[PDB]
């Protein structure tokens, strides 16, 4: 009875119409315009925008935004007079615990990814505060995304 | 002749502001005399003939003028206002016959894109817009750290007699992930364009060395200042200064010999770190090796430190001597400790990991992942506990305790007498 019931419920036309759950890239963006970059950013240093959920990194004299959803995790190391921060970003291979249905990046075999950036600074205290604030911003983002999924 | 000048402009991320000037002879920049910059006060001058192209884009301190030279160098001038664009465009066009290009950058915050090796800079594009560019002159080294992973080290901006003090947080290392069967070709093309030192002459190479931490068949190429480990998936460059200690320890199987390198900073493979490199040799493995050195360089630098040729001796001895001569580190051999079985070490378990403990003259050393080095000067007390044909040793130090379990009870007295002889406080529950 169940064999026939299943054969009736599922037709070969439904099999042809396969709603492949292509991973739905959750589209996020840090800024649309250069005028949205805060005036504070000017000391060629790491800065955090909690409003735009964005980490701004000093790459070769340019204020490069990275959205908190592209950020995976980081580490901090003290070495002589300098403090090092390594920031790791989401890439295939080094994947996060997210399911196959929703990727933090758009699907692409030809896409290359920034896997990690390592910075150094003479000021240890501020660099420790910046790392704490990045980690807190990630916790708040993950909590809001869980709350959304539960709702 | 209308000289156009801009005050408060910075050269290559300089801490001090300067005065920028455009002349028919070229570009000039001079630091403003108000800051005691231990440093030449000499004006930077770029001839008009060396200018190839000029781009205008958003920098940290306002707008940035990026000048591409015919000598594959990039000059960065930051601190311009948005109004300066019209004046700069007209003056650069009039003086050099070069178009000022406005380059918009990606602000999306995505870490994916396409890399593009341009003549003087590596460009990372996000949605057909540049997110960032790195001049090849800022890249110190590049190294494949994964079938799909490329690590670029950047020149540390410290103290050089020719560079202005930089202001801010400095980028030291960039790691890219290049999927597809593609990262090796990208690495080769980056090497050709960045013009890295070429015709390198390894002093000595050792092929097919089986490591244990991490396990792999690495080729070891030795140079004057650095050691290279080449592997099927990961290449490592270790500076000779970063080698802290060399251990040369016989395995208790009496068939193998361990050579162990302590490296600081510890080697990275993705997220895992290797502070100790553990190599495993056969004791019967013999190798003949001639050093690739000129007779003048050998006599001047390496006489009495290295042999010109090593005869057919055991590979681990030749390697240990070469490492001693190039790193100037002392090789630590087994100490005066002899087990009841006349062995140089004892079998034990550290947590779930089975291994061998060596009681060396200055330190206790465990040689199986994880590798544990304990200097006697850091040990507060050793407690022997009864689990029994076996007993356990808890070593207490200022940073915690390590329990070595499953040690044969016959080895208890030799270990206690040796540790008391080294001045370590032994407590017996």
């Amino acid at each position: 009875k169940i064999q026939k019931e299943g054969l009736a419920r599922f037709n070969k036309s439904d099999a042809q119409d396969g709603n492949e759950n292509h991973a739905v890239f959750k589209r996020y963006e840090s800024y649309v315009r250069e005028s949205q970059i805060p005036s504070k950013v000017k000391n060629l240093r790491i800065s955090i925008d909690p409003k735009a959920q964005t980490i701004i990194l000093p790459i070769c004299g340019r204020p490069v935004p990275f959205h908190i959803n592209s950020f995976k995790n980081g580490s901090k190391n003290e070495e002589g007079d300098y403090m090092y921060i390594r920031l790791n970003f989401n890439s295939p291979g080094m994947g996060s615990s997210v399911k196959k249905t929703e990727l933090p990046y758009e699907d692409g075999d030809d896409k290359e990814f920034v896997r990690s950036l390592t910075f150094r600074s003479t000021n240890k205290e501020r660099m420790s505060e910046v790392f704490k604030a990045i980690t807190e911003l990630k916790k708040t983002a993950v909590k809001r995304d869980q709350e959304r999924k539960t709702m | 002749m209308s000289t156009v000048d801009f005050d408060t402009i910075f050269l290559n991320q300089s801490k001090a502001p300067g005065r920028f000037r455009i002349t028919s002879s070229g570009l000039g920049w001079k630091p403003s005399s108000q800051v005691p910059t231990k440093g030449k006060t000499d004006p930077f001058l770029l001839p008009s003939g060396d200018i190839l192209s000029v781009s205008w884009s958003r920098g940290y301190r306002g707008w940035e003028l990026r000048v591409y030279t015919r000598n594959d160098k990039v000059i960065m001038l930051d601190g311009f206002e948005q109004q300066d664009f019209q004046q700069l465009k007209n003056e650069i066009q009039r003086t050099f016959n070069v178009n000022l290009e406005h380059k918009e950058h990606s602000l999306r915050g995505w870490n994916w894109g396409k890399t593009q090796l341009t003549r003087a800079e590596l460009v990372f594009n996000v949605n057909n817009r540049p997110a960032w560019e790195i001049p090849y002159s800022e890249i110190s080294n590049s190294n494949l750290t994964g079938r799909h992973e490329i690590s670029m080290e950047l020149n540390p901006k410290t103290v050089d007699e020719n560079h202005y003090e930089t202001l801010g947080d400095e980028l030291v290392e960039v790691r890219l992930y290049v999927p597809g069967q593609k990262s090796q070709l990208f690495y080769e093309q980056l090497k050709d364009k960045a013009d890295f030192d070429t015709t390198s002459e390894a002093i000595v190479s050792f092929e097919d060395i089986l490591f244990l931490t991490p396990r792999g068949r690495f080729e070891i190429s030795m140079y004057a200042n650095n050691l290279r480990l080449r592997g099927q998936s990961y290449d490592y460059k270790i500076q000779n200064k970063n080698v802290l200690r060399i251990f040369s320890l016989p395995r208790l199987d009496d068939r193998h010999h361990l050579v162990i390198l302590q490296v600081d900073p510890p080697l990275r493979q993705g997220q895992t770190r290797y502070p100790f490199l553990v190599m495993q040799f056969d004791r019967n493995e013999e190798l003949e090796v001639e050093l690739n050195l000129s007779d003048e360089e050998y006599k001047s630098k390496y006489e009495g430190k290295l042999n010109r040729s090593y005869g057919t001796d055991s590979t681990y001895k030749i390697l240990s001597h070469c490492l001693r001569g190039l790193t100037e580190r002392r090789v630590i051999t087994p100490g005066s400790f002899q087990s009841q079985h006349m062995q140089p070490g004892v079998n034990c378990s550290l947590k779930a990991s089975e291994g061998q403990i060596y009681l060396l003259d200055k330190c206790l050393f465990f040689a199986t992942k994880p590798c544990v080095y304990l200097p006697y000067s850091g040990i507060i007390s050793v407690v022997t506990s009864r689990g029994s044909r076996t007993f356990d040793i808890e070593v207490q130090f200022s940073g915690g305790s390590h329990t070595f379990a499953n040690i044969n009870k016959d080895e208890q007295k030799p270990i206690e007498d040796f540790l008391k002889g080294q001045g370590v406080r032994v407590k017996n529950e």
Side-chain angles (χ1 to χ4, degrees):
Chain A
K1 183 181 174 188
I2 280 159
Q3 170 74 353
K4 300 164 191 175
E5 277 177 342
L7 285 171
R9 296 167 196 179
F10 301 103
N11 284 310
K12 195 167 186 162
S13 54
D14 305 352
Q16 294 173 0
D17 300 356
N19 187 8
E20 302 179 1
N21 294 352
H22 297 272
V24 181
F25 168 55
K26 184 177 178 179
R27 191 171 177 167
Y28 54 82
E29 63 184 6
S30 290
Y31 309 109
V32 183
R33 300 181 184 164
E34 294 179 359
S35 66
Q36 305 175 7
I37 305 177
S39 298
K40 184 264 171 184
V41 195
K42 202 177 181 179
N43 300 348
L44 289 149
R45 281 177 177 182
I46 300 172
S47 63
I48 302 157
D49 187 358
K51 295 184 178 183
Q53 298 181 0
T54 291
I55 310 170
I56 303 164
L57 299 181
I59 305 184
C60 303
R62 296 193 184 282
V64 185
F66 289 90
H67 189 270
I68 195 61
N69 295 348
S70 62
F71 177 75
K72 189 174 183 179
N73 57 351
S75 64
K76 79 185 197 149
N77 297 330
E78 296 181 18
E79 321 186 349
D81 299 334
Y82 299 91
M83 180 168 191
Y84 291 72
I85 293 190
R86 181 177 286 182
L87 303 177
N88 307 315
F89 302 92
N90 294 323
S91 70
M94 204 181 60
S96 300
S97 60
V98 199
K99 302 179 180 180
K100 287 185 175 185
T101 325
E102 288 185 343
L103 290 169
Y105 52 79
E106 191 180 0
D107 305 4
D109 298 357
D110 290 334
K111 289 167 180 163
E112 299 170 356
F113 288 68
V114 176
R115 190 171 186 150
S116 69
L117 299 172
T118 307
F119 292 87
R120 72 178 192 164
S121 161
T122 53
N123 190 319
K124 303 185 178 179
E125 294 180 352
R126 175 186 54 88
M127 189 60 91
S128 281
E129 291 175 354
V130 168
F131 188 74
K132 286 175 183 178
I134 290 167
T135 304
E136 184 171 10
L137 186 66
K138 186 62 176 193
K139 286 175 180 181
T140 304
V142 172
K143 185 182 177 195
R144 185 184 290 117
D145 280 351
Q146 293 175 353
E147 286 170 354
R148 190 190 297 219
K149 288 183 180 205
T150 53
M151 292 288 193
Chain B
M1 285 182 156
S2 50
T3 49
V4 177
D5 58 321
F6 300 88
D7 291 322
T8 65
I9 304 306
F10 304 87
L11 176 71
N12 297 334
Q13 309 166 29
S14 65
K15 177 175 169 192
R19 185 167 176 182
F20 176 64
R21 299 189 186 162
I22 304 177
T23 64
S24 58
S25 61
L27 304 182
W29 181 95
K30 185 182 176 176
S32 183
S33 51
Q34 294 187 345
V35 186
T37 303
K38 301 179 180 180
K40 281 177 173 178
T41 53
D42 298 339
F44 176 77
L45 300 174
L46 178 72
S48 58
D50 294 349
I51 302 170
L52 180 67
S53 65
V54 190
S55 69
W56 179 258
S57 58
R58 190 69 176 79
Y60 260 84
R61 295 181 178 155
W63 295 86
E64 181 193 352
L65 192 78
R66 186 175 291 180
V67 182
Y68 300 95
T69 67
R70 295 186 185 180
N71 303 334
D72 306 335
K73 296 179 184 178
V74 182
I75 298 155
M76 300 174 276
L77 292 161
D78 56 353
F80 300 98
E81 299 199 359
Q82 190 171 13
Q83 303 178 0
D84 303 337
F85 176 71
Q86 301 179 359
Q87 185 178 8
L88 283 167
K89 183 174 180 178
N90 294 336
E91 290 299 343
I92 293 169
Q93 188 66 26
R94 183 183 181 195
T95 307
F96 308 118
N97 196 41
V98 175
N99 293 330
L100 183 63
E101 294 183 359
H102 184 216
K103 193 177 185 188
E104 292 191 359
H105 285 72
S106 190
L107 307 176
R108 292 192 173 186
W110 301 351
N111 72 299
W112 58 101
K114 293 189 175 191
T115 63
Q116 301 179 359
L117 295 169
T118 66
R119 189 177 181 181
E121 60 183 3
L122 170 63
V123 182
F124 189 78
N125 290 322
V126 176
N127 185 9
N128 305 330
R129 295 182 183 216
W132 50 266
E133 317 91 341
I134 299 171
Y136 296 133
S137 61
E138 295 198 337
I139 306 180
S140 67
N141 195 18
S142 55
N143 294 303
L144 284 161
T145 56
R147 192 176 187 175
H148 299 296
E149 295 178 38
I150 307 177
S151 298
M152 299 172 293
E153 297 182 349
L154 297 194
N155 288 290
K157 305 177 177 183
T158 51
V159 176
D160 303 346
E161 297 179 337
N162 292 326
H163 278 53
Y164 300 95
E165 288 184 359
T166 38
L167 196 279
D169 301 339
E170 295 176 350
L171 186 68
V172 180
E173 184 194 21
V174 178
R175 305 193 183 191
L176 301 176
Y177 175 83
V178 180
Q181 301 178 7
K182 285 185 184 176
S183 69
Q184 182 173 353
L185 288 199
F186 181 89
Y187 173 75
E188 289 168 8
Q189 291 177 0
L190 178 67
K191 185 184 174 185
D192 297 345
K193 285 183 170 206
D195 301 357
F196 293 112
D197 188 14
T198 62
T199 69
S200 61
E201 297 181 2
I203 296 175
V204 57
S205 54
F206 301 86
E207 297 181 9
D208 202 26
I209 296 177
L210 187 51
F211 280 57
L212 285 178
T213 310
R215 194 263 179 183
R217 317 238 56 179
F218 296 88
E219 182 203 347
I220 304 187
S221 295
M222 309 196 171
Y223 306 88
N225 296 332
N226 309 306
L227 179 78
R228 191 175 179 169
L229 310 176
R230 292 180 177 170
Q232 187 178 16
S233 311
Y234 295 91
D235 283 3
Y236 305 110
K237 188 172 186 166
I238 300 155
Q239 296 179 330
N240 292 349
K241 63 174 178 179
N242 296 357
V243 182
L244 296 185
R245 300 185 183 94
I246 305 159
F247 306 86
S248 185
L249 302 176
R251 193 173 167 162
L252 307 173
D253 301 359
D254 299 348
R255 294 177 179 181
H256 299 102
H257 198 101
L258 303 176
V259 182
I260 309 173
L261 300 177
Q262 185 172 9
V263 190
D264 189 20
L267 277 169
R268 298 189 183 245
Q269 192 179 12
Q271 180 180 0
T272 51
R273 308 193 201 152
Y274 301 109
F276 297 97
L277 309 173
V278 182
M279 299 167 281
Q280 183 185 8
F281 297 90
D282 190 339
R283 277 172 153 187
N284 305 327
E285 192 196 330
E286 295 175 353
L287 184 72
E288 181 169 11
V289 185
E290 298 194 346
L291 299 186
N292 190 21
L293 291 170
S294 67
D295 292 343
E296 299 185 0
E297 288 175 326
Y298 178 77
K299 286 174 184 172
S300 59
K301 292 176 183 169
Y302 299 110
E303 188 167 7
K305 296 183 183 177
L306 296 174
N307 299 340
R308 180 65 184 87
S309 57
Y310 296 87
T312 312
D313 299 352
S314 317
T315 304
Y316 75 87
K317 293 179 181 164
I318 298 173
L319 183 74
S320 298
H321 188 271
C322 291
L323 287 164
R324 180 182 170 193
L326 294 176
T327 69
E328 307 190 341
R329 302 307 189 189
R330 297 185 183 192
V331 182
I332 303 168
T333 54
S336 72
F337 179 74
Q338 295 175 352
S339 73
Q340 184 69 15
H341 301 296
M342 300 292 294
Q343 298 193 330
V346 183
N347 289 322
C348 67
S349 59
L350 179 68
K351 305 179 178 181
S353 64
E354 297 182 350
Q356 297 177 349
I357 191 161
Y358 296 89
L359 298 175
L360 311 172
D361 303 340
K362 298 188 180 185
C363 55
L364 181 166
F365 189 83
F366 183 66
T368 60
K369 199 173 183 179
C371 288
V372 180
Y373 168 79
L374 293 169
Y376 294 137
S377 63
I379 292 167
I380 298 171
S381 53
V382 178
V383 184
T384 63
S385 56
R386 295 180 181 160
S388 65
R389 292 182 179 177
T390 58
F391 79 105
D392 307 335
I393 297 179
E394 189 186 4
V395 185
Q396 299 182 342
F397 58 97
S398 57
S401 70
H402 285 307
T403 313
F404 300 95
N406 200 33
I407 301 176
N408 189 11
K409 186 178 179 184
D410 302 330
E411 302 292 358
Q412 184 176 354
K413 296 180 181 176
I415 293 170
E416 286 191 24
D417 293 342
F418 185 83
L419 289 174
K420 288 166 193 156
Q422 298 304 329
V424 181
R425 294 180 181 186
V426 185
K427 294 178 182 171
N428 298 352
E429 285 189 341

